[PDB]
Structure 1
Amino acid sequence: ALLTPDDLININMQLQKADSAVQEVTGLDIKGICKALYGTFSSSEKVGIVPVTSGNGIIGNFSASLHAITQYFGFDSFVTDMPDVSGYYEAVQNGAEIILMADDRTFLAHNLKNGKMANNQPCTGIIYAEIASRYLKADSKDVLVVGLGKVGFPGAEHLVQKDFRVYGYDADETLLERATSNLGIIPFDPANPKKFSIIFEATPCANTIPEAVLSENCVLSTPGIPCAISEELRDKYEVQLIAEPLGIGTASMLYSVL
Structure 2
Amino acid sequence: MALLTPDDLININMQLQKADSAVQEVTGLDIKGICKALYGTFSSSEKVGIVPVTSGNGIIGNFSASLHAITQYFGFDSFVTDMPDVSGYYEAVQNGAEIILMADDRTFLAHNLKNGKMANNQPCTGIIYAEIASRYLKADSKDVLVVGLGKVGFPGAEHLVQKDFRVYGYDADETLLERATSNLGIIPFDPANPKKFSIIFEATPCANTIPEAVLSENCVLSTPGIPCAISEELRDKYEVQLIAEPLGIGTASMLYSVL
| Same fold per superposition (TM over 0.5) | yes
For residues 112 and 232 of structure 2, the distance between their equivalents in structure 1, rounded to whole angstroms, comes to 40
Task: Give the aligned partner of residue 176 of structure 1.
Answer: 177
- The count of aligned residue pairs is 258
CA distance in 1 between counterparts of 2:151 and 2:6 reads: 23
Give the superposition deviation at 1:104: 0.3
* 3-state secondary structure, aligned to 2:20: helix
Shift of 1:36: 0.1
Q: Give the C-alpha shift of residue 182 in structure 1.
A: 0.4
**Partner Cα distance (2:234, 2:187) in 1:** 26
TM-score, normalized by length of structure 2? 0.99
**Shift in Å, 1:230:** 0.2
Task: Report the CA distance between 1:150 and its aligned residue.
Answer: 0.1
Cα separation, 2, equivalents of 1:185 and 1:35 = 27
Q: CA deviation at 1:139?
A: 1.1
Q: For residue 124 of structure 2, what is the aligned residue in structure 1?
A: 123
- SS of residue paired to 1:90: helix
Q: Could you list the per-position Cα deviations for residues 153-194 of structure 1 after superposition, in whole angstroms to 9, with x for gaps in the alignment?
A: 000000000111101000000000010010011100001111
Q: Aligned partners of 1:97, 1:163: CA distance in 2, in Å?
A: 36
Any unmatched runs of 5+ in structure 2?
none
- Secondary structure, aligned partner of 2:79: strand
Structure 1: segments with no counterpart, 5+ residues: none
Q: By how many angstroms is 1:107 displaced?
A: 0.2
Which 4+ runs in 1 deviate beyond 6 A? Answer: none
Task: Tell me how far apart the structure 2 counterparts of residues 184 and 67 of structure 1 sit (CA, whole Å).
Answer: 39
What TM-score do you get using the length of structure 1 for normalisation?
1.00
Indicate the SS of the match to 1:215: coil
Distance 1:156 1:200 in 2: 8
Deviations 1:176-217 (Å, cap 9, x if unpaired)? 001001001110000111110000000000110011110110
Q: Percent identity?
A: 100
- Residue 136 of structure 1 corresponds to 137
Deviation at 1:140, TM superposition (A): 1.4
Listed one character per residue, the Cα deviations across residues 126-163 of structure 1 (whole Å, up to 9, x for unaligned) are: 00000011000111110000000000000000000011
- Partner-residue secondary structure (3-state), 1:166: strand
Tell me, in whole angstroms, the C-alpha distance in 2 between the residues paired with 1:191 and 1:9: 38
Give the 3-state SS of the residue equivalent to 1:40 in structure 2: coil
Residue pairs, 1:76-91, within 5 angstroms: 76-91=77-92
